[PDB]
Amino acid sequence: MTKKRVVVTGLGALSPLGNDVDTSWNNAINGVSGIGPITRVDAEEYPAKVAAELKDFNVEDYMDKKEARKMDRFTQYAVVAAKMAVEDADLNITDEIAPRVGVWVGSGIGGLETLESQFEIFLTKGPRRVSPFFVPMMIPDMATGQISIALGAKGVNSCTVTACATGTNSIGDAFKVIQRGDADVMVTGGTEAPLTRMSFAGFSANKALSTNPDPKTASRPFDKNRDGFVMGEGAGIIVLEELEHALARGAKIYGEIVGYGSTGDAYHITAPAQDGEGGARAMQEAIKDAGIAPEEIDYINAHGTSTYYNDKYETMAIKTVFGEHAHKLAVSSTKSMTGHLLGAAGGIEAIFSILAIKEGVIPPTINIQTPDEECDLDYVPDEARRQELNYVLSNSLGFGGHNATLIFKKYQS
Amino acid sequence: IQMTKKRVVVTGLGALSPLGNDVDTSWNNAINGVSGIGPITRVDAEEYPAKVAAELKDFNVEDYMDKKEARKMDRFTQYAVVAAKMAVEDADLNITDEIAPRVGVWVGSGIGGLETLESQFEIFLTKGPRRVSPFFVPMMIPDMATGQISIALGAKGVNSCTVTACATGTNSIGDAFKVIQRGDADVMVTGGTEAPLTRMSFAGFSANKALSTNPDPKTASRPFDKNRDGFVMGEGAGIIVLEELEHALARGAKIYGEIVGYGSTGDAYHITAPAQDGEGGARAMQEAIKDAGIAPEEIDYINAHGTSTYYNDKYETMAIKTVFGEHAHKLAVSSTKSMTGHLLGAAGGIEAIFSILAIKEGVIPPTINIQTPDEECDLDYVPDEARRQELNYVLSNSLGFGGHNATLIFKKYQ
Ligand SMILES: C/C=C/C/C=C/CCC(=O)[C@H]1O[C@H]1C(N)=O
Ligand SMILES: C/C=C/C/C=C/CCC(=O)[C@H]1O[C@H]1C(N)=O
Ligand SMILES: [K+]
Ligand SMILES: [K+]
Ligand SMILES: [K+]
Ligand SMILES: [K+]
């Protein structure tokens, strides 16, 4: 059998930059920051003072209150974003095509807020007052579960959990499902609602978070004075579709997914391998998968978390893979604006990568004020660039040494 | 534009289960109808309606690693690392700098480090966030089993963690199977791990009435029995080494069997309740049969999901009839959860191992504890006693919350 071509036919998102794709994207290409003071928890207890939160998100605008009450925020975001994506796709999921429409959405930690609140009930009211809905509300695969129920999607059904690589791995895995002919449509991406007491406690404890109290400068990928990531929340979901299936229904096509790379550092639980060698290998695997030369890559949407090690090592990995071309292509980290959505990062960044191609605009890295000699590539500082793009690469890396890369291409017949 | 299709064989097995702290012990107990269920000891069960569980017996992690290393791993990760090392040793696989990028790891867990989360959050509440460990986040996340296995083995290839509730172990193995099939790794260390015997897990599964409240360990787990009343929770890890065939042959590997089919569907029905008549499960079995390119009649033995809840065993029986027709009464079905309890995310891992060994050894493990026939569950559940038989194809089912259905098909290797 021949490999199927896989195109992107719908986009859905909730992010700190907007409660839909258009607003999120429009804010991104105008260098708008989604970072502000923490409100979701009490910032007094942590060295971190800022976060990238959804603004003005009222879940009841999208579903009944009683339905939302049986969903952790991570699931709420996923269901809202998935429905948005399917509506954008104008896909009618009938009984006839339901077994060929699947869902592959990941989350890095799933319903942590629900776990915390229920454990507190356990401690104060006793185990017999834990909710009958606790288990399904907490497990990370309930985003996929609830999405499939909301959509009537009966096909291949999964959830990848790979830390900060989650959103990228999930999309790549869905891509492979369609390539091998096991689904015609996959609703896929990542979702995360990690703004909780234990998440702030945990990422403070290992010094991962920026302790910069100024929301204007906290997230500054590649900057000499970067000091950690700024945590965000949301979901980025796309509809992937087999090409002939898309054409036959007159689907709109944003672009094509053509390459996916997955490697492991096998080095350390949290620290990236020296020189970003594992990330270099993942990019090389994605490039070989797409059947292109490295020079064909026009823009890299970096993982670019604003930690010391990540941005330095990702720069090294890019130089290793692209050689002289590393100084010719454009790189940017949109985490400068959205913050780090953890398991949802790969999802929103896939959306930005796809729209960069569709609209011919490279979103900038904001907040670079002090150049770092070790991070000397072209990070598209401050201002978006209008440019025709043919190929875009997006990286995600995670704890556990996960490296994941996707390559997107401008759709040509 | 060519779609690569490699053959994928099983070259190593490793396990910790309530039936033993290795594969040989677990397997020999299974074919002898031995129960791994007893009183709960891991937590104080006075405040839960459930009184029995399937725990590892005499598992001391310090027998496998230094205490200092164990203290940086949640039990779910301990089990995964120990089982994975056993699987790689069984495979006699030497991972070097040279083949490292072609060796990957795909181990799932349903919930990951829940005990760590409970203990660290109680510390947060009682002592404050400064007392939360720098190791809390990596210790808790489900993919740390894959991460720690990767680090221990030096495996640098395709790397992932599927989390699909009670389908987790089966999905993980199928996903690893597809990686090798499409040419993206030569070896995958894959399976499921779970350490769900915790205060919140017992509280949660009591609150939704999933657990059996039967206080008698002799009858608590009784899949397909008229008086079944919920599952008995267990723990452990089942890990296997999948390998591309020519690679396995080149290094002189021993081959237990071949993986040939994988089916994944969603009910799209309810967050916890299975779809009417197990229709989604039937579709997953049908997809796996199609993937394997065989007729339903070629299946000799089904290792059922068989959790001992009313609805699972009833609907799984219906699904089997739907898929196999008259052949449903000709093949053998059994649930080894009658002996192991329900290992949740690790269930598909240990059950994959039992399915593979059933083929290699030509022995079908029984369903124990069936005393009262249920008119609705009237298939051949291989009751009480193992059955010696030459098997060519075995199918293993898993189903989970979120409406996940996953099926694997294994084949005898020439
Ligand atoms: C509370 C956890 C939510 C999801 C967890 C993600 C793992 C942490 C990461 O991978 C982030 O450390 C950042 C990175 N390596 O990009
Ligand atoms: C609290 C621990 C969660 C880890 C595993 C969750 C799986 C939930 C399920 O799918 C189980 O209900 C059993 C089943 N459907 O077989
Ligand atoms: K920091
Ligand atoms: K990226
Ligand atoms: K029950
Ligand atoms: K099974």
Side-chain angles (χ1 to χ4, degrees), chain B residues 40 48-53 196-214 220 228-234 307-309 342 344 401:
Chain B
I40 299 175
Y48 310 102
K51 308 300 183 186
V52 304
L197 304 180
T198 81
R199 294 192 289 172
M200 284 304 294
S201 175
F202 275 109
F205 285 113
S206 298
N208 61 17
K209 307 190 286 184
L211 297 179
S212 172
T213 57
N214 188 348
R228 66 194 187 272
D229 69 344
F231 73 82
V232 173
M233 188 143 51
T307 57
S308 204
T309 71
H342 191 348
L344 307 187
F401 282 178

Short mmCIF file of all heavy atoms in Angstrom, two decimals, chain B residues 40 48-53 196-214 220 228-234 307-309 342 344 401:
data_model
loop_
_atom_site.label_atom_id
_atom_site.label_comp_id
_atom_site.label_asym_id
_atom_site.label_seq_id
_atom_site.Cartn_x
_atom_site.Cartn_y
_atom_site.Cartn_z
N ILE B 40 -6.20 -6.72 51.75
CA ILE B 40 -5.42 -5.52 51.47
C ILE B 40 -4.42 -5.29 52.60
O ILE B 40 -4.81 -5.26 53.77
CB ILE B 40 -6.34 -4.30 51.37
CG1 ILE B 40 -7.34 -4.50 50.23
CG2 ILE B 40 -5.51 -3.04 51.20
CD1 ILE B 40 -8.38 -3.39 50.13
N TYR B 48 -12.69 1.51 53.77
CA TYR B 48 -13.22 1.21 52.44
C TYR B 48 -14.15 0.01 52.47
O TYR B 48 -13.97 -0.90 53.28
CB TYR B 48 -12.09 0.95 51.44
CG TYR B 48 -11.05 2.04 51.45
CD1 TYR B 48 -9.84 1.85 52.10
CD2 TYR B 48 -11.29 3.26 50.83
CE1 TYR B 48 -8.89 2.85 52.13
CE2 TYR B 48 -10.33 4.27 50.86
CZ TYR B 48 -9.14 4.05 51.51
OH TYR B 48 -8.19 5.03 51.55
N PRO B 49 -15.15 0.00 51.59
CA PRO B 49 -16.04 -1.15 51.41
C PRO B 49 -15.33 -2.33 50.73
O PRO B 49 -15.75 -3.47 50.92
CB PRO B 49 -17.16 -0.58 50.52
CG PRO B 49 -16.58 0.64 49.89
CD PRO B 49 -15.63 1.20 50.89
N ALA B 50 -14.26 -2.07 49.98
CA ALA B 50 -13.47 -3.15 49.39
C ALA B 50 -12.44 -3.67 50.41
O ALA B 50 -11.82 -2.87 51.12
CB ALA B 50 -12.77 -2.67 48.13
N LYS B 51 -12.27 -4.99 50.49
CA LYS B 51 -11.41 -5.59 51.50
C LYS B 51 -10.28 -6.45 50.94
O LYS B 51 -9.41 -6.89 51.70
CB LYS B 51 -12.23 -6.44 52.48
CG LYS B 51 -13.41 -5.71 53.10
CD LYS B 51 -12.98 -4.48 53.89
CE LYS B 51 -14.19 -3.82 54.55
NZ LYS B 51 -13.86 -2.54 55.24
N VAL B 52 -10.28 -6.69 49.64
CA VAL B 52 -9.25 -7.55 49.04
C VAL B 52 -8.55 -6.85 47.89
O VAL B 52 -9.07 -5.88 47.32
CB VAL B 52 -9.83 -8.92 48.57
CG1 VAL B 52 -10.53 -9.64 49.72
CG2 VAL B 52 -10.79 -8.73 47.40
N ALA B 53 -7.35 -7.32 47.56
CA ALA B 53 -6.58 -6.76 46.45
C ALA B 53 -5.61 -7.82 45.99
O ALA B 53 -5.43 -8.84 46.65
CB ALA B 53 -5.83 -5.51 46.88
N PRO B 196 -1.50 1.19 41.62
CA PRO B 196 -2.72 1.93 41.94
C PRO B 196 -3.25 1.61 43.32
O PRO B 196 -4.34 2.03 43.66
CB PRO B 196 -3.69 1.40 40.89
CG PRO B 196 -3.31 -0.06 40.82
CD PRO B 196 -1.80 -0.11 40.99
N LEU B 197 -2.50 0.88 44.14
CA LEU B 197 -3.01 0.55 45.46
C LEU B 197 -2.69 1.71 46.40
O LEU B 197 -1.69 1.68 47.14
CB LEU B 197 -2.39 -0.75 45.96
CG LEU B 197 -2.61 -1.94 45.02
CD1 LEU B 197 -1.96 -3.20 45.58
CD2 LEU B 197 -4.10 -2.16 44.81
N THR B 198 -3.53 2.75 46.33
CA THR B 198 -3.32 3.96 47.12
C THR B 198 -4.63 4.38 47.74
O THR B 198 -5.70 3.88 47.36
CB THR B 198 -2.79 5.15 46.26
OG1 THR B 198 -3.88 5.77 45.56
CG2 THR B 198 -1.73 4.69 45.25
N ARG B 199 -4.55 5.31 48.68
CA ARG B 199 -5.75 5.77 49.37
C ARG B 199 -6.80 6.37 48.42
O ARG B 199 -7.98 6.04 48.52
CB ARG B 199 -5.37 6.76 50.47
CG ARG B 199 -4.57 6.11 51.59
CD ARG B 199 -4.45 7.03 52.78
NE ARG B 199 -3.57 8.16 52.52
CZ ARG B 199 -3.40 9.19 53.35
NH1 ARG B 199 -4.08 9.24 54.49
NH2 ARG B 199 -2.57 10.16 53.02
N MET B 200 -6.37 7.25 47.51
CA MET B 200 -7.33 7.89 46.60
C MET B 200 -7.85 6.92 45.54
O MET B 200 -9.00 7.02 45.13
CB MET B 200 -6.73 9.13 45.93
CG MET B 200 -6.66 10.35 46.82
SD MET B 200 -8.26 10.82 47.50
CE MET B 200 -9.17 11.31 46.04
N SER B 201 -7.00 5.99 45.11
CA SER B 201 -7.43 5.00 44.14
C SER B 201 -8.52 4.12 44.75
O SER B 201 -9.58 3.91 44.15
CB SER B 201 -6.26 4.17 43.66
OG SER B 201 -6.70 3.13 42.79
N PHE B 202 -8.28 3.61 45.96
CA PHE B 202 -9.34 2.83 46.61
C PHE B 202 -10.59 3.66 46.88
O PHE B 202 -11.72 3.20 46.66
CB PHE B 202 -8.84 2.18 47.91
CG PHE B 202 -8.15 0.87 47.69
CD1 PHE B 202 -6.78 0.75 47.85
CD2 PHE B 202 -8.87 -0.25 47.33
CE1 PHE B 202 -6.15 -0.46 47.65
CE2 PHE B 202 -8.23 -1.47 47.13
CZ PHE B 202 -6.88 -1.56 47.29
N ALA B 203 -10.40 4.89 47.35
CA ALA B 203 -11.53 5.77 47.59
C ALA B 203 -12.33 6.02 46.31
O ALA B 203 -13.57 5.95 46.32
CB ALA B 203 -11.06 7.09 48.19
N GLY B 204 -11.61 6.29 45.22
CA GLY B 204 -12.23 6.62 43.95
C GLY B 204 -12.98 5.46 43.34
O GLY B 204 -14.11 5.62 42.86
N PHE B 205 -12.37 4.28 43.34
CA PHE B 205 -13.00 3.10 42.77
C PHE B 205 -14.06 2.47 43.67
O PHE B 205 -14.86 1.66 43.20
CB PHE B 205 -11.94 2.07 42.34
CG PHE B 205 -11.20 2.44 41.08
CD1 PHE B 205 -9.85 2.75 41.10
CD2 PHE B 205 -11.86 2.47 39.86
CE1 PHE B 205 -9.18 3.08 39.93
CE2 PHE B 205 -11.18 2.81 38.69
CZ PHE B 205 -9.85 3.11 38.73
N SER B 206 -14.07 2.83 44.96
CA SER B 206 -15.20 2.50 45.83
C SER B 206 -16.35 3.46 45.58
O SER B 206 -17.51 3.05 45.55
CB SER B 206 -14.81 2.56 47.30
OG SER B 206 -13.80 1.62 47.60
N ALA B 207 -16.03 4.74 45.40
CA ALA B 207 -17.07 5.75 45.23
C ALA B 207 -17.88 5.53 43.95
O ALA B 207 -19.08 5.81 43.94
CB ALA B 207 -16.47 7.16 45.25
N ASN B 208 -17.24 5.03 42.90
CA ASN B 208 -17.97 4.76 41.66
C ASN B 208 -18.46 3.31 41.56
O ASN B 208 -18.95 2.89 40.52
CB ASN B 208 -17.16 5.14 40.43
CG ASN B 208 -15.87 4.37 40.32
OD1 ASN B 208 -15.70 3.33 40.96
ND2 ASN B 208 -14.94 4.87 39.50
N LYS B 209 -18.30 2.57 42.66
CA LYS B 209 -18.81 1.20 42.79
C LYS B 209 -18.16 0.19 41.82
O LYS B 209 -18.71 -0.87 41.56
CB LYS B 209 -20.34 1.16 42.68
CG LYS B 209 -21.04 2.11 43.66
CD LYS B 209 -22.55 1.87 43.72
CE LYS B 209 -23.27 2.39 42.49
NZ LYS B 209 -24.74 2.21 42.64
N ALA B 210 -16.97 0.51 41.33
CA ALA B 210 -16.30 -0.39 40.39
C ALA B 210 -15.72 -1.61 41.09
O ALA B 210 -15.71 -2.70 40.52
CB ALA B 210 -15.21 0.35 39.64
N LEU B 211 -15.26 -1.44 42.32
CA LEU B 211 -14.61 -2.54 43.04
C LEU B 211 -15.63 -3.51 43.58
O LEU B 211 -16.73 -3.12 43.98
CB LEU B 211 -13.79 -2.02 44.22
CG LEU B 211 -12.62 -1.10 43.92
CD1 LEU B 211 -11.96 -0.69 45.23
CD2 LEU B 211 -11.61 -1.80 43.02
N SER B 212 -15.26 -4.79 43.61
CA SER B 212 -16.02 -5.78 44.35
C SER B 212 -15.92 -5.51 45.86
O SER B 212 -14.82 -5.24 46.38
CB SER B 212 -15.49 -7.18 44.07
OG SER B 212 -16.11 -8.12 44.93
N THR B 213 -17.05 -5.60 46.55
CA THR B 213 -17.10 -5.45 48.00
C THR B 213 -17.04 -6.81 48.67
O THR B 213 -17.22 -6.93 49.89
CB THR B 213 -18.39 -4.72 48.45
OG1 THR B 213 -19.54 -5.44 47.97
CG2 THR B 213 -18.42 -3.30 47.91
N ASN B 214 -16.81 -7.86 47.88
CA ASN B 214 -16.75 -9.21 48.43
C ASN B 214 -15.53 -9.32 49.35
O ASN B 214 -14.41 -9.14 48.90
CB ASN B 214 -16.64 -10.21 47.28
CG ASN B 214 -16.77 -11.65 47.72
OD1 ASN B 214 -16.72 -11.96 48.92
ND2 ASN B 214 -16.94 -12.54 46.76
N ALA B 220 -13.79 -13.41 45.30
CA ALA B 220 -13.97 -12.00 44.94
C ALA B 220 -13.88 -11.77 43.44
O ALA B 220 -14.77 -11.16 42.85
CB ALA B 220 -12.96 -11.13 45.69
N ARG B 228 -20.73 -12.29 40.13
CA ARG B 228 -19.67 -11.29 40.04
C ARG B 228 -20.24 -9.92 40.42
O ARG B 228 -21.43 -9.66 40.20
CB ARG B 228 -19.08 -11.26 38.63
CG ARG B 228 -20.05 -10.78 37.54
CD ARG B 228 -19.52 -11.10 36.15
NE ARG B 228 -20.36 -10.51 35.11
CZ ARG B 228 -21.43 -11.10 34.58
NH1 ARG B 228 -21.80 -12.31 34.99
NH2 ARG B 228 -22.12 -10.48 33.63
N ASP B 229 -19.41 -9.08 41.03
CA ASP B 229 -19.91 -7.84 41.63
C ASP B 229 -18.87 -6.72 41.61
O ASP B 229 -18.96 -5.77 42.39
CB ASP B 229 -20.40 -8.10 43.06
CG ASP B 229 -19.28 -8.42 44.02
OD1 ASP B 229 -18.15 -8.75 43.57
OD2 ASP B 229 -19.52 -8.35 45.24
N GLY B 230 -17.90 -6.83 40.71
CA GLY B 230 -16.91 -5.77 40.53
C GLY B 230 -15.51 -6.33 40.44
O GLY B 230 -15.29 -7.52 40.69
N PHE B 231 -14.55 -5.48 40.09
CA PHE B 231 -13.20 -5.98 39.92
C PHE B 231 -12.40 -5.94 41.21
O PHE B 231 -12.77 -5.25 42.17
CB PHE B 231 -12.48 -5.31 38.73
CG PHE B 231 -12.05 -3.86 38.96
CD1 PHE B 231 -10.87 -3.56 39.64
CD2 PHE B 231 -12.76 -2.81 38.41
CE1 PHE B 231 -10.46 -2.24 39.81
CE2 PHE B 231 -12.34 -1.49 38.58
CZ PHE B 231 -11.19 -1.22 39.28
N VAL B 232 -11.32 -6.71 41.25
CA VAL B 232 -10.38 -6.71 42.36
C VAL B 232 -9.12 -6.05 41.84
O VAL B 232 -8.53 -6.50 40.85
CB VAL B 232 -10.09 -8.13 42.85
CG1 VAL B 232 -8.97 -8.12 43.89
CG2 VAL B 232 -11.37 -8.77 43.40
N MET B 233 -8.71 -4.96 42.50
CA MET B 233 -7.59 -4.14 42.03
C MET B 233 -6.25 -4.82 42.30
O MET B 233 -6.03 -5.38 43.37
CB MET B 233 -7.66 -2.76 42.70
CG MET B 233 -6.68 -1.71 42.18
SD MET B 233 -7.44 -0.08 42.17
CE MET B 233 -8.05 -0.04 43.85
N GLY B 234 -5.36 -4.76 41.31
CA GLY B 234 -4.03 -5.34 41.42
C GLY B 234 -2.96 -4.34 41.02
O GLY B 234 -3.25 -3.18 40.78
N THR B 307 -13.17 -8.44 33.54
CA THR B 307 -12.84 -7.77 34.79
C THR B 307 -13.64 -8.25 36.01
O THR B 307 -13.31 -7.87 37.13
CB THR B 307 -13.09 -6.27 34.67
OG1 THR B 307 -14.45 -6.05 34.30
CG2 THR B 307 -12.15 -5.66 33.63
N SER B 308 -14.70 -9.03 35.78
CA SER B 308 -15.61 -9.49 36.85
C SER B 308 -16.63 -8.42 37.30
O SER B 308 -17.22 -8.54 38.37
CB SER B 308 -14.85 -10.09 38.05
OG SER B 308 -15.65 -11.00 38.79
N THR B 309 -16.86 -7.39 36.47
CA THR B 309 -18.02 -6.52 36.68
C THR B 309 -19.20 -7.10 35.90
O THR B 309 -19.00 -7.85 34.95
CB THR B 309 -17.77 -5.06 36.22
OG1 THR B 309 -17.71 -5.00 34.79
CG2 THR B 309 -16.47 -4.51 36.81
N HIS B 342 -7.18 -7.09 38.63
CA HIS B 342 -7.18 -6.14 37.54
C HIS B 342 -6.03 -5.15 37.71
O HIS B 342 -6.07 -4.28 38.57
CB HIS B 342 -8.52 -5.39 37.53
CG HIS B 342 -8.74 -4.57 36.31
ND1 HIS B 342 -7.74 -4.29 35.41
CD2 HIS B 342 -9.85 -3.97 35.82
CE1 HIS B 342 -8.21 -3.55 34.43
NE2 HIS B 342 -9.50 -3.34 34.65
N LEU B 344 -5.16 -2.76 35.90
CA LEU B 344 -5.47 -1.46 35.30
C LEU B 344 -4.59 -1.19 34.06
O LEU B 344 -4.65 -1.94 33.09
CB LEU B 344 -5.38 -0.33 36.34
CG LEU B 344 -6.23 -0.59 37.59
CD1 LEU B 344 -6.24 0.63 38.51
CD2 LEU B 344 -7.66 -1.01 37.26
N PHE B 401 -12.31 3.22 30.69
CA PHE B 401 -13.08 4.45 30.82
C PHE B 401 -12.74 5.35 29.64
O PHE B 401 -11.68 5.22 29.06
CB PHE B 401 -12.69 5.22 32.09
CG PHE B 401 -13.28 4.65 33.37
CD1 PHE B 401 -12.96 5.22 34.60
CD2 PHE B 401 -14.16 3.58 33.34
CE1 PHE B 401 -13.50 4.72 35.77
CE2 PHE B 401 -14.69 3.08 34.52
CZ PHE B 401 -14.37 3.65 35.73
#
